[PDB]
Design a protein around this ligand. Structure first.
Ligand SMILES: [Cu+2]
Ligand SMILES: [Cu+2]
Length: 501
């Protein structure tokens, strides 16, 4: 029973999900696509590779092509599926409950590609057509999108090509003014700017990438997201991590729903949105090229046969499947990489905690009455499935912390941090990217006419970094950051997950 997008031209409705303040909304909620009376045809692969370039190291030609392309797209009539507005509505229609699972036999259930394993493949198809449309608008058959390389220090700030004023096609007034001044991106943003040096921000941005691709991105479930079929799946490490941070970091916090980037329904109206996801799409490639155990593609038929519908460069309706976007070579595009051998985030594992900087009585899961609400710092000891595991055992299965049944009002942005075994003496110098930090759970608004979620955290490296591989219990600390005044956690447990081959 795979998720199947219906006739987006026939069955569609106004966006009513993920919008806290529907009144005084800067962008439209009528995200339905144009009706050209088109028949949905099956997808077919292209022929001869599009090289996507770093937005911060683009040449005059590369930048001019992109600017001229967006300008051409902005020039098209709104009724055109290939227009700037129509393309932005695509994200709104799929992320803010524009369609339903009517094709699966459930017209009362909305389709939501986010917070599931449909996250990566959908946005890949989204960019694929969005990329080919722009290329056709400027008569560039080998046109390629840039990508925001925020995993590299010099590429972390927003590229100046997007800055300027309305004369620039890549400009968007609806961005955070405090963040467009050549300032470094915060890949662990929680709604409030941190008072740290630029050196520290870059160092911890690299750590965030390492945390999302290695520490937490241990298996297909933890990386892509939870299983989602027709009829509260886990959110991926990338999706609920660096990805969400950038959206809230760029979005203008003065606007009602943090438009444009700060919300799904309006994100498409900012040109940087597609360039951000261009690098999120690249995380998928890097995640595999690491060639670490567990870093494999999805093989579940329920995922492979899942499909969406898009307008292509020829205004034709095309149905694409997830099974046909695992190989970039077949889609005929890739990313221009640096000559340097390794990636600066490749070894950005948090430093080992000194025992001399560490020092007790905390309730366990049995002694605690669930569900608990995260209106303050919450601590609890969780029984581990094993202790003193050998290098062979830790290389065969991941010890994963599971925070399940996360209930909360998804009318606004929510985030809380997760610390494990934080027994630091009270005179120690702390940093954002400390070893105790397991990561966080962040969610862009996606409410429906209180949402429930689940998080996953790897402990293989963390327990070693905190000198607690021999301890029977692990002290888990949940720290609310924003929108947790009503958040509720239903279950907490640690389990050994075998690494798939
Ligand atoms: Cu999206
Ligand atoms: Cu996004």
């Amino acid at each position: 029973a795979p998720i199947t997008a219906p006739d987006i031209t026939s069955i569609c409705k106004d966006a009513s999900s993920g919008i806290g303040n529907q009144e005084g909304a800067i962008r439209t909620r009528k995200c339905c696509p144009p009706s050209l009376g088109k028949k949905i045809k099956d997808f077919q692969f292209p022929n001869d590779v599009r090289m996507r370039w770093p937005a911060h190291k683009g040449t005059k030609k590369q930048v001019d092509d992109y600017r001229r392309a967006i300008a051409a797209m902005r020039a098209l009539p709104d009724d055109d599926p290939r227009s700037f507005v129509s393309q932005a509505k695509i994200h709104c229609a799929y992320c803010n409950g524009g369609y339903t699972q009517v094709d699966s036999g459930f017209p009362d259930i909305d389709i939501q590609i986010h917070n599931s394993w449909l996250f990566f493949p959908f946005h890949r198809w989204y960019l694929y057509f969005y990329e080919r449309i722009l290329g056709s608008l400027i008569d560039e058959p080998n046109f390629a999108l840039p990508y925001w390389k925020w995993d590299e220090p010099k590429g972390m700030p927003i590229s100046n090509i997007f800055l300027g004023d309305a004369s620039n096609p890549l400009y968007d007034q609806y961005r955070d003014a405090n963040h467009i001044e050549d300032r470094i991106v915060d890949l662990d943003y929680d709604g409030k700017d941190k008072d740290i040096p630029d050196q520290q921000q870059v160092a911890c941005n690299l750590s965030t990438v390492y945390r999302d691709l290695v520490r937490n991105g241990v298996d297909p479930t933890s990386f892509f997201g939870g299983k989602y079929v027709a009829g509260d799946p886990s959110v991926g490490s990338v999706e609920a991590g660096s990805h969400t941070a950038v959206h809230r970091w760029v979005g203008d916090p003065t606007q009602p729903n943090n438009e444009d980037m700060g919300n799904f329904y309006s994100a498409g109206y900012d040109p940087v949105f597609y360039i951000h996801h261009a690098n999120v799409d690249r995380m998928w490639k890097l995640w595999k090229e690491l060639r670490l155990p567990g870093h494999v593609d999805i093989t579940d038929p329920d995922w492979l046969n899942a499909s969406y519908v898009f307008y292509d460069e020829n205004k034709d309706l095309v149905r694409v499947y997830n099974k046909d976007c695992v190989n970039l070579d077949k889609l005929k595009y890739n990313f221009i990489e640096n000559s340097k051998e390794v990636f600066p985030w490749r070894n950005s594992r948090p430093p080992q905690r000194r025992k001399s900087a560490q020092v007790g009585d905390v309730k366990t899961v049995e002694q605690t009455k669930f569900p608990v609400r995260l209106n303050q710092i919450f601590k609890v000891r969780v029984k581990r499935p094993a202790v003193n595991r050998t290098e062979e055992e830790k290389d065969q299965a991941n010890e994963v912390l599971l925070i399940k049944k996360i209930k909360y009002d998804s009318g606004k942005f929510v985030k809380f941090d997760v610390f494990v075994n934080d027994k630091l003496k009270d005179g120690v110098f702390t940093t954002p990217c400390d070893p105790e930090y397991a990561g966080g759970f962040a969610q862009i608004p996606h409410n429906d006419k209180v949402m429930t979620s689940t998080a996953r955290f790897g402990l293989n490296e963390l327990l070693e970094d905190t000198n607690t591989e021999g301890e029977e219990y692990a002290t888990v600390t949940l720290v609310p950051r924003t929108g947790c005044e009503d958040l509720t956690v239903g279950e907490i447990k640690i389990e050994l997950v075998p690494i798939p081959k």
